[PDB]
């Protein structure tokens, strides 16, 4: 790159911009870390709720299989149409799109509530709420993973700047400064020579 | 959605109308999970923790550019009846996505 | 020599001139002309000429010019972040400022010295172009605050009218300006 | 030049704040202009004559096409007059020197004309000593009631503070007031940027019995709050308005109102009480207890007023 | 040297486009070599032999092992011959000065021996005037058939455009053709990057009745689009290609297609119509509404063609 | 010129001087006085002065000084982690070393030049303060190994004793040091 | 001086020489000898020697050399993407290009002037090594298109033969090349 | 200075391992201090006195407040004495020049006093010639048993290897030993960074009859393994992932153990056999899956050490 005073000023300005960018990215990472540590607590709550839902769902399954034959519960599972009515809107977090799950779970798929075995309704409702709690857990996990990936990206950018962009600009600045100082030294030497020659050629000629 | 766990849990999820697969070992569950992903109809796949501790080892083999069929590990009903380790899972998750062992 | 503005002749000239029109090779390479470096240029006559502008161009001309300069300053400030994280990392308001800045640079500051119409521009034509651009900016910011996307804003054909404004002849410019102001108001009423 | 003229025709002493009430203490302004154009000369003459500030001023106006030796001699004449008035008639003298960059260039040219080999960066090797002989003539003397105060004005050649002229001036003088180009192009006058500015002798001339008991703490709190507002203004561009905390939005509002009302003074002449009132009104935008640099006594005595000095009741 | 030889081989006027419609004599070539090496000299001699232009070419050869002070006389003698031929025998003369860096080296040597007050990098302060007294001898004179066209060649020492020799030369001449080392390393020939290049007299020779009505606007649009592509390359160097929008992706594709097709042409001789249709095929990669610098008439007349339609 | 240590005068000076006391204005901003930055500062006279310290103040003095320096180094090395996440979320041992670094900064490195007693400090008084601090750190490390809460330790009455240590007169310091070393051991013995 | 290629001697030399063999300090520090900066170096004799290379080494030798240079160009370009995104998150084809560039460097470009065999390399030995590398690259590219993961490609023992090719004496090399060709064919036939 | 004193104390011929086994030939150390402070002078005098190395030593000590010409003349006197001893009394002389940066500053001062043509940073244009006239006096002469060895220590200004002093010194000398500031920050002494250091004459000074037969292969393997560890840890920073291939973690652990045991030796006077034992213990990598940079069958003879220290 061309060493000039104007180019030296441009390099110094670029160094200042890089330092300001490092500070800005650190502030962004601070905000991301605050959001991430909120989301980790929220996901912990969701996971505990999922634990309780799974506990009661398995209890209901065991009680139903004790009080009803496996063939009957298997046929009941066959009879209900699958709750395939699911979709994920593209939630946008920090400029990134994430799939946010939502399930309809229509009650029209429940067959003969008063005609089913004794504990089939209880197991059905327990597993339905367990599944929707699982969808809640999945939403929390995907949001947390996206925020963590954003934190890692910001850390990558900050590290790259502070480690290879700023030192390179500093080295370029010192190189340009040395070249300019050398040119100034050469100019001073030439000025000394021509002053000496002025004095000498005036002295002998008189 | 879809769930991959022991046949009891798969039957219980089919009881609520959700796709379920019964698997006893990790390789069988992952093999069927690949075909399930290739199907792509379900937006979410649940896999047992005692079956596949880390389904991230299978998420990225398929769905290379798309993430809509999200997947997550879950505690199987056998150990969920005993109890799920929420705090250990949270610590390992924050370590996995950050890596600084920061808690309390 | 070498474009080094720190050279003694340029520095000696800085200290005695009331206006400084600094050119940069970056815009000349792009064939963006007149290629005046806005950041590095200045004029010390803006304040003293304001009464003449009010009497001869429009009573609100100095305020309009100051608003344009403030937009350019805001764009210059946001470019520091754009060069850092890319233009898509900005919010809608800041990205709107960036887009309005490039609109200003492309269809107000550019001037083709060889085009038979664009070679010359009267003060009132420049006033009309500035008024059109700032009316579009105000309406676009209002639409941003009501939830309209910036990529939706950028597709309006009234942007094409603003861009082609500078090629309109002096004689027929007032009608074009009135039509374009009506179009701005109508487009940002209909498109919310 | 506008700021120089405004300071020249607005600067005054406040003996009533010290409790002296001694308006008998005279005040004079010595204005030295070096390497100015006819436009600047006409502006300065008009400004000094229109307000009547000429009657307490002495003008040494050297034009750009005048001999450079006259440019070198101009600050000497101005400081001779200032020293005479201050230390022989007890005047309080403010000396404004515009522009010291022109003086340094004249010194460089005269040194080259005398066949002297230039020093660092092409300027004379004795430029530090010459600038010192100019600057160090200001001061207060034990046993004498007069004073000489200097406000050199210099244009940094490429907005570079590493340039020899601003560098040596910083070595010799007590701080600096830095004008801001980004403030100027946003329409704010005077475009003084508080963050890079610094007065090294400020803490000696403010406080109880001099200005007011709260001056230093108010200044510190204003500085810290403005810095926070500026960096949050940078952050909000990427993370958005709502992502910030409520106090962060309050800092944003504070920085905006600060630039709008405190810095953007215009051609108003604000007494120190007016400026302190505006500062307290701006600090009242921040929640009480967020003002950490200020003691609770001053907060209780002054916090609460709202922005009425500039808008709603000018 | 290859580019200069190719230009001397292919250069021709187009009277049919200019409306003159007459047969034209070929260029007479005056070749001034200053400090030329044996490799470059042999290349030039063999090229002029193969193209048969030696019988109408005057050669002033100063070798790299010849004394360096003769390089002061060499271009002045060459241009004296060129001016004589052009303005007293109606010849159209093309003058090639093989290396002006060596001429400036000899000038610096003479000035330093005389202790001339130097400019930047130790070159004498009168170097601008001395180079002007050489360059300004080209042109066209009223009432004369002949002409002098100069194509000096200089090697910027460290590819530094701010070096005194290229700086003064650019201050004297009507623009310049700048070669790009990045394009050369890509294998693109000729490695001419258009952004730092310039032709100040381009407006005089192009347009309606001279080449074609869309020439100037097509050139401007190409410059704007290529600059956008370069900026988007710089952006990709930060955010990565996958993070781009589709329009920035289009500009990136235009930039690399431009480099690989419009610039990279090898030794083939393209007519101005071929170059213009290639340019329009390149511009057809972009959305029609983004050709802001082209009038709608030219867009309607020429937009749409594809590169694969030009060549298989 | 602007705090750049690479300038010729600073480079020439640091090549011959035996110590560099890098006074820092950031510490002065945070009311840390004498505001000497313990990082980026060095002294080459420790090794040669070690025998005099062993003879004249205490035989254990160099090792105690090294222990204080190591605690400061650990506090410095945890600064990035405590920056990314707050100290409350930090691990218990890291929390303890951060707190002991703060204790050192507040009660040993801090010195009130205007205080009627703290303006001067003898070598033995500094040695006593350092030994009290290392006794606290040893006891707190043991207690953390045996499961007490860091917030219980951070409220011990011995902490204000260590804080007030540097404000006692020179002749009163020996008995104060003895009774404080008794109190610290008793307090940490009482804890579980 | 200081490795600055802009110094007068280097620049005045570059104007007259026909070949420019630029050495690099970064390669010399890491013991990557001969340490030629292949990106900065050039030769103006490469084209004029092509008939001799076709007649005396192999009819297709210039094409092999051009393909090797293209692979090095692609690897150098992809290094920036590697540093930006990380080598993990780019496609298996680009990872194959990166690994083939690494193979080219360490097994063809690197040469030990003190090794009793590696110190000298005939033109035909270099041509054989280039043929080995390019055959491996094309077969591995076909395997990548064939759904083979790059992990097992990178684990193939044929890479050891390719790496050890340069230590084979000139007398043995013609047979080692034949067996290496057959092994390259057989390995990616065995992938099925 | 500490490393210079340690080398002066510990340097020995080791003729017993040599094929020409004999009673030790006379060995001497000529020590030249240039621009030295009183504190460093006291340190060096104490170091040479406390171990008896002074008896086999000649010291030339130019203080910082001495006339500047004596700093110029000091290496001339030191090398004159060294050449006299080595080539007229068959001594093996080791010469240590404490700080060539001070000598070059003195040379710049003298040259500017004579108003010579300047150089890259004010140093005389002939500084290369002067430094060469100093350094080239070292060597071994055919037909004479003695030898002259030079270890010029110099302080790189601002750690810039492209500064004129280290640049010209490297252009003259056969290699360099470069101290690492990062290794110094980690508390490692001596903080020698092996990656940028080089000994040009090494490849013909080790082998059978000189050191041990496995010396060059062991050195090649250590350099390769440390480079692999460093280039793993540098990629870890960019990737930000400790989770990585298993064999990479073996090199990171190898690199840490290498820095903490092989490089970090304090004031220990390790013999070449002891250093080779430590190196082979550090070679806990896989015998063939790793340790493949240098082909060697010395694994069967030396591999299998379990890091046990004394």
Tab-separated table of N, CA, C and O in Angstrom, chain G residues 2-5 20-41 105, chain H residues 161 171 198:
chain	number	residue	atom	x	y	z
G	2	UNK	N	14.768	-5.559	5.827
G	2	UNK	CA	13.518	-5.858	6.494
G	2	UNK	C	12.541	-6.640	5.642
G	2	UNK	O	11.349	-6.695	5.953
G	3	UNK	N	13.029	-7.250	4.564
G	3	UNK	CA	12.152	-7.969	3.663
G	3	UNK	C	11.279	-7.097	2.792
G	3	UNK	O	10.348	-7.609	2.166
G	4	UNK	N	11.553	-5.797	2.729
G	4	UNK	CA	10.722	-4.848	1.992
G	4	UNK	C	11.040	-4.955	0.507
G	4	UNK	O	12.089	-4.504	0.050
G	5	UNK	N	10.115	-5.533	-0.262
G	5	UNK	CA	10.322	-5.698	-1.694
G	5	UNK	C	10.231	-4.387	-2.462
G	5	UNK	O	10.498	-4.379	-3.668
G	20	UNK	N	10.986	-14.269	-11.522
G	20	UNK	CA	10.951	-13.636	-10.208
G	20	UNK	C	10.592	-14.707	-9.184
G	20	UNK	O	9.431	-15.109	-9.079
G	21	UNK	N	11.594	-15.171	-8.440
G	21	UNK	CA	11.413	-16.223	-7.442
G	21	UNK	C	11.348	-15.563	-6.069
G	21	UNK	O	12.358	-15.330	-5.408
G	22	UNK	N	10.129	-15.263	-5.640
G	22	UNK	CA	9.920	-14.521	-4.405
G	22	UNK	C	9.882	-15.475	-3.219
G	22	UNK	O	8.997	-16.332	-3.133
G	23	UNK	N	10.834	-15.327	-2.307
G	23	UNK	CA	10.830	-16.095	-1.075
G	23	UNK	C	9.997	-15.385	-0.015
G	23	UNK	O	9.787	-14.172	-0.065
G	24	UNK	N	9.529	-16.161	0.957
G	24	UNK	CA	8.587	-15.671	1.955
G	24	UNK	C	9.134	-15.995	3.336
G	24	UNK	O	9.625	-17.104	3.565
G	25	UNK	N	9.057	-15.025	4.249
G	25	UNK	CA	9.528	-15.251	5.611
G	25	UNK	C	8.593	-16.177	6.377
G	25	UNK	O	9.039	-16.963	7.220
G	26	UNK	N	7.287	-16.085	6.112
G	26	UNK	CA	6.331	-16.922	6.829
G	26	UNK	C	6.542	-18.400	6.533
G	26	UNK	O	6.361	-19.239	7.420
G	27	UNK	N	6.922	-18.736	5.301
G	27	UNK	CA	7.203	-20.128	4.970
G	27	UNK	C	8.540	-20.577	5.541
G	27	UNK	O	8.703	-21.750	5.894
G	28	UNK	N	9.508	-19.665	5.628
G	28	UNK	CA	10.821	-20.026	6.149
G	28	UNK	C	10.778	-20.248	7.655
G	28	UNK	O	11.485	-21.115	8.178
G	29	UNK	N	9.967	-19.466	8.370
G	29	UNK	CA	9.852	-19.643	9.813
G	29	UNK	C	9.278	-21.011	10.153
G	29	UNK	O	9.683	-21.643	11.135
G	30	UNK	N	8.329	-21.484	9.352
G	30	UNK	CA	7.664	-22.753	9.597
G	30	UNK	C	8.344	-23.922	8.902
G	30	UNK	O	7.724	-24.979	8.749
G	31	UNK	N	9.595	-23.750	8.477
G	31	UNK	CA	10.395	-24.799	7.846
G	31	UNK	C	9.751	-25.353	6.582
G	31	UNK	O	10.010	-26.497	6.203
G	32	UNK	N	8.906	-24.568	5.916
G	32	UNK	CA	8.363	-24.960	4.618
G	32	UNK	C	9.304	-24.464	3.522
G	32	UNK	O	9.149	-23.382	2.956
G	33	UNK	N	10.302	-25.281	3.234
G	33	UNK	CA	11.284	-24.927	2.220
G	33	UNK	C	10.951	-25.619	0.902
G	33	UNK	O	10.346	-26.693	0.905
G	34	UNK	N	11.333	-25.057	-0.257
G	34	UNK	CA	12.165	-23.880	-0.549
G	34	UNK	C	11.626	-22.510	-0.122
G	34	UNK	O	12.372	-21.539	-0.240
G	35	UNK	N	10.378	-22.432	0.343
G	35	UNK	CA	9.748	-21.196	0.806
G	35	UNK	C	9.476	-20.212	-0.323
G	35	UNK	O	9.566	-18.999	-0.121
G	36	UNK	N	9.148	-20.710	-1.513
G	36	UNK	CA	8.779	-19.838	-2.618
G	36	UNK	C	7.337	-19.384	-2.443
G	36	UNK	O	6.431	-20.202	-2.244
G	37	UNK	N	7.120	-18.075	-2.515
G	37	UNK	CA	5.775	-17.506	-2.504
G	37	UNK	C	5.200	-17.682	-3.901
G	37	UNK	O	5.393	-16.835	-4.775
G	38	UNK	N	4.485	-18.787	-4.119
G	38	UNK	CA	3.991	-19.093	-5.457
G	38	UNK	C	2.946	-18.096	-5.936
G	38	UNK	O	2.735	-17.975	-7.146
G	39	UNK	N	2.285	-17.385	-5.024
G	39	UNK	CA	1.339	-16.362	-5.449
G	39	UNK	C	2.053	-15.106	-5.935
G	39	UNK	O	1.623	-14.486	-6.913
G	40	UNK	N	3.142	-14.716	-5.268
G	40	UNK	CA	3.857	-13.518	-5.669
G	40	UNK	C	4.880	-13.739	-6.761
G	40	UNK	O	5.267	-12.789	-7.446
G	41	UNK	N	5.336	-14.975	-6.939
G	41	UNK	CA	6.349	-15.261	-7.940
G	41	UNK	C	5.737	-15.303	-9.336
G	41	UNK	O	4.522	-15.401	-9.511
G	105	UNK	N	1.086	-28.774	-1.840
G	105	UNK	CA	2.144	-28.054	-1.143
G	105	UNK	C	3.138	-29.023	-0.523
G	105	UNK	O	4.287	-29.125	-0.969
H	161	UNK	N	11.166	-7.547	14.281
H	161	UNK	CA	12.252	-8.289	13.654
H	161	UNK	C	12.744	-7.620	12.377
H	161	UNK	O	13.847	-7.924	11.914
H	171	UNK	N	21.134	-11.133	8.699
H	171	UNK	CA	21.779	-11.223	7.395
H	171	UNK	C	23.236	-11.644	7.504
H	171	UNK	O	23.785	-12.182	6.537
H	198	UNK	N	16.364	-20.635	14.653
H	198	UNK	CA	17.014	-21.454	13.643
H	198	UNK	C	18.514	-21.479	13.886
H	198	UNK	O	19.110	-20.458	14.238
